[PDB]
């Protein structure tokens, strides 16, 4: 019955190995997603700042013309 105990514990160890490799994989996946979302927010910020840029530029041109 020794060979069965040997096999059984090796099976437990294998699952453990799978478990940690996959947890690390999820970590990696989440980190990439994090980067994707972060950049999305950055781009949102960019559009906002570009719009304010456009707003200021036209406002100044108009105002400056008057004076």
């Amino acid at each position: 019955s020794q060979s069965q105990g040997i096999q059984q514990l090796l099976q437990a160890e294998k699952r453990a190995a799978e478990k940690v490799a996959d947890a690390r994989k999820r970590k990696a996946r989440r980190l990439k997603q994090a980067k994707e979302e972060a950049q999305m927010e950055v781009e949102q910020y960019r559009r906002e700042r570009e719009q304010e840029f456009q707003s200021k530029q036209q406002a100044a041109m108009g105002s400056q013309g008057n004076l």
Binding site: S1, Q2, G5, Q8, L9, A12, E13, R15, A16, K19, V20, A23, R24, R26, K27, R30, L31, Q33, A34, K35, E37, A38, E41, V42, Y45, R46, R49, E52, F53, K56, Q57, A60
Partner: protein
């Protein structure tokens, strides 16, 4: 000892290994989520401020 004790020893060998594995993986995922948010925030703030500086200097130049 009989095969019943062998199997008990085995059960124990499995059981502790599985518990350790379960705890470590849980620890790993919780920290992973923490690292997700930490790295995300750092990156965002890092580049947002640079964008701001770009914008502000140009605005000043505009006026």
């Amino acid at each position: 000892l009989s095969d019943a004790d062998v199997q008990k020893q085995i059960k124990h060998m499995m059981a502790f290994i599985e518990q350790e594995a379960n705890e470590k993986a849980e620890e790993i995922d919780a920290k992973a989520e923490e690292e997700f948010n930490i790295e995300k925030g750092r990156l965002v703030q890092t580049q947002r401020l640079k964008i701001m500086e770009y914008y502000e200097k140009k605005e000043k130049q505009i006026e």
